[PDB]
Amino acid sequence: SSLSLNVGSRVPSLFDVPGKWVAAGRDAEKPPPSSVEDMFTSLNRCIRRPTHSFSRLLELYLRVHVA
Amino acid sequence: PMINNAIRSFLTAWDDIRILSPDVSSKSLSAYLDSAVANGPELII
């Protein structure tokens, strides 16, 4: 906040590592049908959404014309 | 750009220290002077 460029941004601290390890244990666990349908509905909402812009890097990459 | 960040940091460095202060006015002059009134010996009895 003092340098004032980001807020809440992900920086790889060592408290991400128990979050990295424990989430690397439930990935092999079979998900419940509540989690699959929530993953499934988020697909169709992601496809049909009217966000017709790219990411803010590819929108900046396309200024560069290479030949 | 980057040098303006040192400007913005400095002018907000002193402003936060400045607003961390009691209010100065003529009311503080009378409030300080009230402390010198109550410690008065009665002589004219």
Coordinates of C-alpha atoms in Angstrom, one line a residue:
Chain A
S1 CA 0.0 0.0 0.0
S2 CA 2.9 2.4 0.7
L3 CA 4.6 1.8 -2.7
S4 CA 1.0 1.8 -4.0
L5 CA 0.9 -0.5 -7.0
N6 CA -1.1 -3.6 -6.0
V7 CA -3.4 -4.9 -3.3
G8 CA -3.8 -8.5 -2.1
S9 CA -1.6 -9.7 -4.9
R10 CA -0.3 -13.3 -4.8
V11 CA 3.4 -13.4 -3.8
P12 CA 5.0 -16.8 -3.2
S13 CA 5.5 -16.8 0.6
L14 CA 6.1 -20.0 2.7
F15 CA 2.5 -19.8 3.9
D16 CA 1.4 -20.8 0.4
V17 CA 3.3 -24.0 0.8
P18 CA 0.9 -25.7 3.3
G19 CA -1.8 -24.3 1.0
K20 CA 0.2 -25.9 -1.9
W21 CA 0.7 -29.3 -0.1
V22 CA -2.8 -29.9 1.3
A23 CA -4.4 -28.9 -1.9
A24 CA -2.0 -31.4 -3.6
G25 CA -3.7 -34.1 -1.5
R26 CA -7.3 -33.5 -2.3
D27 CA -6.7 -33.3 -6.1
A28 CA -6.4 -37.1 -6.2
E29 CA -9.5 -37.5 -4.0
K30 CA -12.7 -38.2 -5.9
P31 CA -14.8 -34.9 -6.0
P32 CA -18.4 -35.0 -4.8
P33 CA -21.2 -34.4 -7.4
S34 CA -21.8 -30.9 -5.9
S35 CA -18.2 -30.0 -6.9
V36 CA -18.4 -31.5 -10.4
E37 CA -21.7 -29.7 -11.3
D38 CA -20.3 -26.5 -9.9
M39 CA -17.3 -27.0 -12.1
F40 CA -19.6 -28.0 -14.9
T41 CA -21.9 -25.0 -14.7
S42 CA -18.9 -22.7 -14.5
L43 CA -17.9 -24.0 -17.9
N44 CA -21.1 -23.1 -19.7
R45 CA -21.1 -19.7 -18.0
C46 CA -17.5 -19.1 -19.1
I47 CA -18.3 -20.0 -22.7
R48 CA -21.5 -18.1 -23.1
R49 CA -20.4 -14.9 -21.3
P50 CA -20.2 -11.8 -23.5
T51 CA -16.6 -10.9 -22.5
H52 CA -15.3 -10.6 -26.0
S53 CA -11.9 -9.2 -25.1
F54 CA -8.6 -11.0 -24.7
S55 CA -6.3 -10.7 -21.7
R56 CA -4.6 -7.4 -21.2
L57 CA -1.3 -8.8 -22.5
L58 CA -2.5 -10.2 -25.8
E59 CA -4.4 -6.9 -26.2
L60 CA -0.9 -5.3 -25.8
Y61 CA 0.9 -7.9 -27.9
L62 CA -1.2 -7.2 -31.0
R63 CA 0.2 -3.6 -31.2
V64 CA 3.5 -5.2 -32.2
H65 CA 3.6 -6.2 -35.9
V66 CA 6.4 -8.5 -36.8
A67 CA 7.4 -9.5 -40.3
Chain B
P1 CA 6.8 8.5 -13.1
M2 CA 9.1 6.7 -10.6
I3 CA 10.4 10.1 -9.3
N4 CA 6.8 11.2 -8.8
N5 CA 6.3 8.2 -6.5
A6 CA 9.0 9.6 -4.2
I7 CA 7.1 12.9 -4.4
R8 CA 3.8 11.3 -3.5
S9 CA 5.4 9.2 -0.7
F10 CA 7.1 12.3 0.8
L11 CA 4.1 14.6 0.8
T12 CA 2.0 11.9 2.4
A13 CA 4.8 11.1 4.8
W14 CA 4.7 14.6 6.4
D15 CA 0.9 15.0 6.1
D16 CA 0.2 11.9 8.2
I17 CA 2.6 13.1 10.8
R18 CA 1.1 16.6 10.6
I19 CA -2.5 15.4 11.1
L20 CA -1.3 13.4 14.0
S21 CA -1.5 16.5 16.2
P22 CA -3.9 18.2 18.6
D23 CA -5.9 21.1 17.3
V24 CA -4.1 24.4 17.7
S25 CA -6.3 27.5 18.0
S26 CA -7.0 30.3 20.5
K27 CA -9.1 27.9 22.5
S28 CA -6.0 26.0 23.5
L29 CA -4.5 29.3 24.7
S30 CA -7.5 29.9 27.1
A31 CA -7.6 26.2 28.1
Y32 CA -3.9 26.3 29.0
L33 CA -4.6 29.6 30.9
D34 CA -7.4 28.0 32.8
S35 CA -4.9 25.7 34.5
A36 CA -3.1 28.7 35.9
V37 CA -6.4 30.1 37.4
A38 CA -7.5 27.3 39.6
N39 CA -4.3 27.1 41.6
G40 CA -4.8 30.5 43.2
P41 CA -4.5 31.2 46.9
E42 CA -7.3 33.3 48.5
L43 CA -5.7 36.4 50.1
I44 CA -8.5 38.9 50.1
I45 CA -10.7 37.6 53.0

